[PDB]
Write a protein that binds this ligand. Structure first.
Ligand SMILES: *[C@@H]1O[C@H](CO)[C@@H](O)[C@H](O)[C@H]1NC(C)=O
Ligand SMILES: *[C@@H]1O[C@H](CO)[C@@H](O)[C@H](O)[C@H]1NC(C)=O
Ligand SMILES: *[C@@H]1O[C@H](CO)[C@@H](O)[C@H](O)[C@H]1NC(C)=O
Ligand SMILES: *[C@@H]1O[C@H](CO)[C@@H](O)[C@H](O)[C@H]1NC(C)=O
Ligand SMILES: *[C@@H]1O[C@H](CO)[C@@H](O)[C@H](O)[C@H]1NC(C)=O
Ligand SMILES: *[C@@H]1O[C@H](CO)[C@@H](O)[C@H](O)[C@H]1NC(C)=O
Ligand SMILES: *[C@@H]1O[C@H](CO)[C@@H](O)[C@H](O)[C@H]1NC(C)=O
Ligand SMILES: *[C@@H]1O[C@H](CO)[C@@H](O)[C@H](O)[C@H]1NC(C)=O
Ligand SMILES: *[C@@H]1O[C@H](CO)[C@@H](O)[C@H](O)[C@H]1NC(C)=O
Ligand SMILES: *[C@@H]1O[C@H](CO)[C@@H](O)[C@H](O)[C@H]1NC(C)=O
Ligand SMILES: *[C@@H]1O[C@H](CO)[C@@H](O)[C@H](O)[C@H]1NC(C)=O
Ligand SMILES: *[C@@H]1O[C@H](CO)[C@@H](O)[C@H](O)[C@H]1NC(C)=O
Ligand SMILES: *[C@@H]1O[C@H](CO)[C@@H](O)[C@H](O)[C@H]1NC(C)=O
Ligand SMILES: *[C@@H]1O[C@H](CO)[C@@H](O)[C@H](O)[C@H]1NC(C)=O
Ligand SMILES: *[C@@H]1O[C@H](CO)[C@@H](O)[C@H](O)[C@H]1NC(C)=O
Ligand SMILES: *[C@@H]1O[C@H](CO)[C@@H](O)[C@H](O)[C@H]1NC(C)=O
Ligand SMILES: *[C@@H]1O[C@H](CO)[C@@H](O)[C@H](O)[C@H]1NC(C)=O
Lengths: 29, 23, 851, 851, 29, 23
């Protein structure tokens, strides 16, 4: 989690999105 | 740019990646 | 030590038989050819009335190209024995090419070839092509170059009879239809005068022995002087390819070379047409002198190379110059001497002003023969100055400049494609060579997919572990933990994939191999059966044949664009014993009324090892007496009567990326048994019989059964047990012994034995007469009736007989018959479910009632 | 007609159901969605306490990505009917993605999809989805966008049986078994409210009969105004997707696009987001007006395009600039709307300052969508600035530009490899368009065998002629004369080869094909059997099965270095009729002692036309009386027993060239039968019977045959004859009738006929009695003995019976039987090969010896 | 025989040689 | 060079090819 390079891809990226911040997202408009 | 622009091509850090999910 | 050579030498220089027969006169008197001998375009060789037995040895080679009107080579080569190949035309020492009239070689006296191979082509009438064991004649090490084709062997050559010398090594080595090759023992290989008679190593091809004991060589192996053999020449003489010559003789001597004739130079005890490296010929061309600066900078114009013989023209050249690239295009088949010939032809070159190119070559193993090469100037690079080292379609090229070799490159780019064995890693070793020092070669220059596809170069290894095995199943588990995404502290036995989706999954191959030597799959090979891709890393082989050895190996499957490949070694393992199969060909037969025989084989897989055989015989008796019968009217004798694979993933990946880019936004069987035989109630016979037998057996007999019985035969074979099956497992699920099939042998075993005995007769008071008898010891097949007979002791009388359903006569103490005056004899026999018996002996009664 | 649509709509702009279910409170009262509706990242949809039947119609598309805690889509889409697809997300219109909890769709009211298609991915628990016929619900012309994957289909999703509506089309079609698809008849394809209640063409999405008994559209097909459907909007109103609004309203309307929001511009009766070609937005953005110079130029930085959605961003851009190449990398499955989305995204560009590149695309048919392109300036090229048009690994690319489309190339070199469907000739059309105007592309840049290898485009045609055919053989003949060697006077059926050796020979293929449509071989395809290369040009197919249609086709085989390839069309032909196969399942059975029956079938190939069936029946002689037997001491009943090859030729060619360079120097039976029967001399029975039968028949009866006898049965099936056969084949070849196997008959009830007649008795004087009888007309089996019985006409007297071997009693005028005083009767029966006969009636005799 | 280019090769070359030169070849040395 | 160097590559004429004749 700490390191900042992390060539993150695909499903790993999707799951990391949730684990990093499950509260919510901005929505498009 | 978009998520696939900053991550999964080139490399991005989590703290910078946190922008997509502000309250 | 010291030994004479046969005959006295009268050598004649290189020879060419051309056009017409009359030129054969040039072969006059000369025992050996100091050069090469070629016969070609002789339109009709028939008028040749003579032969030339004196000709025995040829120094360079024999080519027979397009000679017509010649049937065999025996006539012109009676005693040709040795071909020494000092000069080796195109790497072939004996050539017989494009002749319509040659039928039989007839080279009875040929024994040895010192260099090069042999090529025979386009001789439609040549029979016996396959007879000879060429590999003995050639140098033992590199025997590969023996090539023969379109000799007419297909069908027309019905005369391949040969003397069957006979089918040695199932190959009749016959010259003509009657002659054959004489082999030599290894102690004197290709140096024997007959099948066993050997010769010392001083000679080559053997020696002749006479009554005087004056053994003489066919030809000296190393050198010859004054018709005597020695290792080296005496001082003041020079070696010339077979013999020792003076300085003047060397000056006069000559040899032909590529549309030129070179006179030999007496140098350092040898007569040679070219000075050694670092030397140059004198102005008078009488001696050689050291090259200035240790290197004579001779230069030659760059040009194509089509075969080895062309390469010789570049001998001794240092600088290859000219805008034309030095296109190497050699085409061999199993290149034997390509390396050495190209070495002789190019070892001198050290700097190329032009650009090298090696296009479409077969059998060119490497570029190691550029020994002295140091710099490919590539000043006018080929292809619009694009490239300075062009490689292509080299079907057998595998490695570039030899070990620890370094060459500079001043211009242009490298190029590589379609080289099967050339691995990409070997190409990348040139990265530090170029003047531009590229960090890597772009996909447009180096064909990373095509190059090296056939070479086991980049196969990263996997620690495949066999987890568990069973009767028909086994589980495989791959130990290597694959990196996906994050580098995760590399150098951990990594195997990596930069995107989780790119990794489709592992692929497990397997195939039955008792020897465990199946090679990896090439693309239509079907030996290997392959399971579907799997990602967890564990697969469960199923439906295996028990106790069968299986080879397996693991490969990684990734989208074609990905390139982080890996594999495993071909490990081998065997399944468990399983359960043995049925016994084959089981038959039962009766030896006697109490002795039985059974025969069987086991022509099917037992699996495991057959610890024991076991047979169980059970008597199953007949039903009781049946009333659907008639007696004395219905008797019986009663014999026996019983693809893309990636498009889906690629599309999924791209759509996933597009969607990610948009969603987010910032802000009755033998269960158990033991040996046993059950006695009858009276212990007269064994009711059942069950015993083990040793695995030697195939047939056996069983004893002390009772007459006329149906003994069902049950047979089985039992296998061994693995320690884990007996200590890690207990006595349940058994499966220890095979399936079975009952064998029935309900025969009338074997004699009449006993049917009825002890007959007696009396009468009540023409008074009725009572006849009594005793039943047999045992029913002769479930007695159903008694046949009772009587006769009168008078002439012309015949025996009368009756029947009863048995067990009724006892009420009257015997069967009653109305009888008249006279003396009568009575007989009785029982009849059973097993048919007739034999009538018992007679006993007499006389009727004489009072009134 | 013009009429009211159901209910009154309350449209609302796109909605974003995100994070938590509470945002559903923004979706109520929304009849239709004016934009797109996306549901992403609901952690738990279970708390949804409502359904929203009012939502019926959506304009752009539906994406359900990573929604969790939702079991079915019915709850949120009770009445979702149609997806107009005015905008596409990557070309798809309804995406349901990566949901762990979706069991069922629930789209009961789904009725029509207007554009794009459907993608369903990574919904493990979804079921019943693979039942619906997506091709019927989509637009008819391009129904290909129906992709689905990993919907738990492996084992767990077997409960998709649907109500099996149940099994229509031999398949289930349901949204869970609770429902089934609402199919529409072809008359109103997907334009119905039920399977027979069609809908008018004015409505779209369905229609409901109103309270007045008249139709009411669910949604207007073309446009809608004031809840009424019409073709076009009234004056002063502009069409915004599915309804007409004023300019003031259109100014307020908005639609989201690629992280941007564009307001609607009222233009030409339509509310527009992007001005049309030749127009640009006003400074106030309130209207579009004509562009100066015919088209406003716009610049966009070059960048990769990995999917259509990215391509949309380039809409309306005229100039693509920057050192970065415009790398197209689309990866579709199947040729979906890509050709149109890319057209929308790039039809405007007319020249590119950078260089184009098409690395690794799938489903990209052509670059025809660069409609306005005129010049690839290629100012900064790439790959060391080598190339300005870089095309690679395009698995489905087949043509570069539009027909006769001209586009300049100002710099750099082209590049092409690995494009399987790109024929080489299509590449060379660029030759006159480059700045350098190359005459041809060097092999370094344009591949030789890697391009277009899969396209049946470069094949020169061969005029194969089928010469002759036979029963099992056929001869082929390649008519096209070959220009081997010099091209002297070309164009004579060219098929050129520069030297005789490069062309190794023709290759013939053949394979059984009754349908005559087998496609040419692709490389493990084993349908085709091949023959070895042949140079003369004629081949003889052999061992064909008679009368079988064989497909065959020819092509030229040449060394890989040569490239003058040619092929032929896949012609087909049939062998000759040959000989019919044996009759199958032949059995004989009785109808009476003289009527016999036979049954057979023909379950094997007849090889031709079965003109007729032929059966021939002939009897065999009975066995005679035998002396090795005894009779009437033992009864007799006796039931009747009755490869590439490249290396070899290459090496040969090269060696031959090297040798040329050096040699020369300057200075029982049925062949024929006729229908007939043979009648016995007594006319009682037919000894033989041979007749034809029509091809209808399979079993027939033959009568008036001898009784007590075996009749050998011989059956045949005969074939037609070709005119060319009959006109010449008089006695040779023939073979017009099948193989046969004799069938013998276990004729039941062939015994017991004519018994015995005319029994009479007489006495010689204890006087013996002579008994006479007559044998039957036809012996009841060959007589071996005659049984005779007699009895005394007194109570309780037994009937004695004795025998005579017959044929010897006649010389005594009968059989002599010892007899005593009294009145007696006699009986006789026959004993023969067929066993006992029946005892004939009685005759009497009285004994009265005188003294 | 007439034309001047006539790219002869392989066996055709030898066949044309042995007729266009029907009587002899001057030997190497 | 030889025949294969003068003909079969950069094809030659029969008249020139006659050079390999006239013993
Ligand atoms: C061999 O040479 C001698 C002269 O040295 C000559 O007379 C003789 O004829 C030659 N051999 C033959 C077979 O002619
Ligand atoms: C055989 O040939 C030789 C030449 O090699 C010649 O001298 C001799 O006269 C010939 N003999 C006959 C019988 O033709
Ligand atoms: C097993 O794994 C080790 C790394 O821990 C590796 O070095 C070794 O090569 C593997 N086994 C084989 C046979 O390569
Ligand atoms: C595979 O083997 C490794 C150790 O070699 C073990 O840690 C792992 O659990 C095994 N995998 C399975 C599925 O048993
Ligand atoms: C099968 O492999 C085992 C070792 O696992 C070996 O002992 C056995 O010999 C092999 N089978 C055969 C037929 O060699
Ligand atoms: C494996 O070795 C055995 C040794 O007897 C040999 O017969 C067999 O041909 C070999 N198989 C392979 C595929 O090399
Ligand atoms: C009979 O038994 C003997 C052994 O007692 C055996 O060798 C032989 O093969 C048997 N033959 C048959 C026909 O069973
Ligand atoms: C027969 O079996 C015995 C074991 O009971 C064994 O010792 C012997 O070697 C076997 N016979 C042969 C010929 O192997
Ligand atoms: C909006 O929806 C609510 C139900 O949540 C309903 O009570 C209200 O009448 C609706 N308003 C309109 C204008 O449709
Ligand atoms: C459903 O939930 C909404 C809020 O999300 C609330 O306004 C409404 O009253 C609820 N209705 C029921 C029946 O629970
Ligand atoms: C050029 O091509 C276009 C379509 O690509 C076609 O409409 C036009 O007629 C063509 N022009 C000529 C002269 O063939
Ligand atoms: C071969 O057939 C094609 C198509 O039928 C025809 O165009 C061509 O002219 C034919 N070739 C010859 C040499 O007749
Ligand atoms: C058929 O083949 C023969 C040679 O086998 C040839 O002469 C004839 O011309 C061929 N047929 C045709 C129509 O060319
Ligand atoms: C086979 O070919 C012939 C013409 O050659 C055609 O009449 C026949 O219909 C073909 N066979 C089938 C099954 O169609
Ligand atoms: C083509 O042949 C295949 C079998 O090879 C057959 O299934 C198919 O129906 C045929 N179609 C036509 C149009 O002949
Ligand atoms: C039986 O054969 C006759 C010709 O003899 C034919 O007309 C008739 O159609 C056949 N029967 C049937 C059912 O086809
Ligand atoms: C007799 O033959 C007829 C047809 O010829 C058939 O239908 C019937 O089954 C046959 N009966 C027997 C007993 O074979």
């Amino acid at each position: 989690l700490p390191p900042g390079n992390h060539k993150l891809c695909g499903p790993a990226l999707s799951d990391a999105m949730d684990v990093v911040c499950p509260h919510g997202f901005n929505t498009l408009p | 740019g978009g998520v696939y622009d900053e991550c999964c091509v080139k490399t991005c850090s989590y703290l910078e990646l946190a922008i997509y999910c502000l309250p | 030590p010291t030994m004479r050579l046969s005959q006295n030498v009268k050598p004649c220089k290189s020879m060419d038989i051309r056009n017409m027969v009359s030129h054969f006169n040039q072969l006059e008197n000369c025992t050996v050819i100091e050069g090469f001998l070629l016969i070609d375009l002789i339109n009709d060789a028939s008028p040749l009335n003579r032969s030339f037995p004196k000709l025995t040895e040829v120094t360079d080679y024999i080519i027979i190209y397009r000679v017509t009107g010649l049937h065999s080579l025996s006539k012109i080569f009676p005693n040709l024995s040795v071909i020494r190949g000092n000069k080796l035309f195109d790497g072939y020492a004996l050539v017989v090419y494009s002749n319509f009239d040659l039928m039989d070689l007839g080279l009875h006296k040929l024994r040895s070839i010192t260099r090069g191979g042999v090529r025979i082509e386009k001789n439609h009438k040549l029979c016996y092509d396959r007879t000879i064991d060429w590999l003995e004649i050639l140098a033992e090490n590199e025997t590969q170059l023996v090539v023969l084709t379109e000799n007419g062997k297909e069908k027309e050559c019905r005369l391949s009879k040969c003397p069957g010398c006979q089918l040695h090594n199932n190959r009749r080595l016959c010259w003509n239809s009657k002659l054959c090759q004489t082999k030599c023992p290894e102690k004197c290989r290709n140096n024997c005068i007959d099948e066993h008679t050997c010769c010392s190593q001083d000679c080559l091809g053997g020696c002749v022995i006479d009554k005087n004991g004056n053994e003489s060589c066919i030809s000296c192996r190393n050198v010859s002087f004054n018709n005597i053999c020695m290792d080296s020449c005496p001082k003041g003489y020079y070696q010339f390819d077979s013999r020792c010559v003076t300085a003047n003789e060397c000056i006069t001597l000559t040899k032909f070379e590529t549309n030129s004739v070179y006179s030999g130079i007496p140098y350092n005890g040898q007569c040679i047409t070219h000075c050694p490296t670092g030397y140059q010929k004198s102005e008078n061309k009488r001696m050689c002198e050291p090259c200035p600066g240790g290197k004579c900078d001779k230069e030659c114009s760059s040009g194509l190379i089509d075969s080895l013989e062309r390469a010789r023209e570049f001998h001794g050249c240092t600088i290859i110059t000219g805008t034309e690239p030095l296109t190497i295009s050699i085409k061999r088949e199993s290149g034997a001497h390509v390396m050495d010939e190209l070495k002789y032809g190019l070892a001198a070159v050290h700097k190329i002003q032009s650009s090298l190119m090696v296009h479409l070559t077969y059998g060119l193993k490497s570029l190691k023969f550029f020994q002295s090469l140091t710099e490919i100037s590539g000043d006018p690079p080929m292809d619009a100055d694009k490239y300075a080292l062009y490689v292509l379609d080299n079907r057998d090229l595998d490695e570039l400049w030899g070990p620890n070799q370094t060459v500079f490159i001043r211009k242009g780019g490298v190029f590589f494609h379609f080289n099967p064995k050339l691995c990409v890693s070997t190409i990348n070793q040139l990265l530090p060579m170029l003047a531009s020092k590229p960090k890597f070669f772009e996909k447009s220059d180096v064909g990373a997919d095509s190059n090296g596809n056939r070479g086991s170069c980049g196969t990263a290894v996997l620690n495949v572990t066999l987890q568990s095995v069973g009767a028909n199943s086994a589980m495989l588990n791959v130990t290597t933990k694959v990196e996906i995404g994050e580098p995760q502290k590399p150098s951990n036995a990594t195997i990596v994939f930069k995107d989780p989706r790119a990794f489709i999954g592992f692929v497990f191959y397997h195939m039955i191999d008792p020897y465990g030597n199946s090679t990896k799959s090439s693309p239509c090979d079907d030996r290997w059966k392959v399971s579907s891709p799997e990602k967890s890393g564990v697969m469960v082989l199923s439906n295996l044949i028990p106790y069968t050895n299986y080879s397996y190996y693991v490969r990684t499957m990734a989208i074609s664009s990905e390139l982080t490949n890996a594999e495993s070694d071909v490990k081998n393992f065997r399944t468990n014993p399983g359960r043995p199969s049925k016994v084959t060909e089981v038959v039962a037969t009766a030896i006697s009324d109490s002795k039985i025989n059974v025969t069987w084989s086991y022509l099917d897989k037992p699996y495991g090892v057959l610890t024991r055989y076991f047979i169980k015989a059970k008597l199953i008796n007949r039903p009781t007496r049946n009333n659907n019968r008639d007696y004395c009217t219905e008797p019986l004798v009663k014999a026996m009567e019983n693809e893309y694979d990636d498009r889906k993933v690629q599309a999924g990946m791209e759509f996933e990326n597009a969607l990610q880019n948009f969603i987010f936004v910032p802000n009755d069987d033998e269960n158990t048994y033991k040996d046993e035989e059950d006695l009858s109630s009276n212990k007269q016979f064994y009711e059942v019989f069950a015993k083990e037998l040793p695995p030697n057996q195939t047939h056996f007999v069983f004893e002390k059964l009772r007459h006329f019985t149906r003994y069902a035969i049950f047979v089985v074979a039992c296998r061994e047990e693995i320690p884990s099956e007996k200590l890690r497992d207990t006595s349940f699920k058994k499966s220890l012994c095979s399936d079975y099939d009952t064998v029935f042998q309900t025969t009338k075993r074997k004699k009449f034995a006993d049917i009825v005995m002890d007959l007696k007769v009396d009468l009540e008071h023409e008074s009725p007469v009572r006849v009594r008898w005793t039943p047999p010891v045992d029913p002769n097949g479930e007695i159903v009736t008694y046949e009772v007979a009587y006769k009168l002791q008078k002439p012309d009388q015949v025996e009368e007989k009756k029947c009863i359903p048995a067990a009724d006569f006892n009420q009257t103490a015997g069967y009653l018959i109305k009888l008249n005056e006279g003396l009568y004899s009575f007989r009785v026999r029982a009849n059973s479910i097993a048919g007739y018996g034999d009538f018992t002996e007679v006993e007499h009664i006389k009727v004489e009632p009072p009134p």
